[PDB]
Amino acid sequence: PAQWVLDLIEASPIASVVSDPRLADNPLIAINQAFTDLTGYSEEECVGRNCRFLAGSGTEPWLTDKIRQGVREHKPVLVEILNYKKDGTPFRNAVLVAPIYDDDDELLYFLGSQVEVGMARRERAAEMLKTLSPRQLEVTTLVASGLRNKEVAARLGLSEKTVKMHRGLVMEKLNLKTSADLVRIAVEAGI
Ligand SMILES: Cc1cc2nc3c(=O)[nH]c(=O)nc-3n(C[C@H](O)[C@H](O)[C@H](O)COP(=O)(O)O)c2cc1C
């Protein structure tokens, strides 16, 4: 588990995981404490496994199916799917799954975040984004969609350092500690 992997998720209070698509079946390579407190699954019993172990009998296949669609298109997707905790108790999981890049902006990975639940988080995220300047929104929209800093820059007619500066600016504006969290807020708002 690279340092950045754990920097990215362990800093988030929301149940979060990271998978590696260059491993067969795109298994998880890390989870944070909140995931364990949500599901009851310890990391030893998650890492190396595809996150489908949260799926069960009532899991609506059409929702599972847009997740796999978002994974293969490399696009963020957010659904409220029926999952099952460790004790077997079913729960409504507002699950985000989004393409994310490592520290070197080289390799693609997948970030998942899970919250037990709705439109309230949506309205919330919308209020947070409303405090950002027009340019910070541009940057936020583009990062959330998966792109690299290099790529976001290319789309705004910017340098990679300027974008970095802007991100740091939104991270402190929104009082966030990890990018995982910013991603989820953008997708929640539809931005
Ligand atoms: C990072 C990540 C997190 C995921 N989290 C969940 C989840 O919390 N709940 C869920 O039902 N599926 C989640 N998925 C997708 C499941 O693995 C999905 O059921 C599986 O990819 C489809 O299995 P199949 O198409 O081989 O039948 C996640 C996928 C990724 C990449």
UniProtKB/Swiss-Prot annotation:
Keywords: Chromophore, DNA-binding, Flavoprotein, FMN, Nucleotide-binding, Transcription, Transcription regulation. Residues 149-168 bind DNA. One of its GO terms (biological process) is regulation of DNA-templated transcription. The modification S-4a-FMN cysteine is found at residue 51. It comes from the Bacteria. Residues 125-190 form the HTH luxR-type domain. It holds the Pfam family GerE. FMN binds at residues 50-52, 68, 83, 114. Monomer in solution, probably binds DNA as a homodimer. Light induces structural changes; in the dark protein is compact and resistant to exogenous protease, in the light protein is less compact while protease treatment generates an N-terminal fragment corresponding to approximately residues 14-156 (the LOV domain). PANTHER family: PROTEIN TWIN LOV 1. This is Light-activated DNA-binding protein EL222.
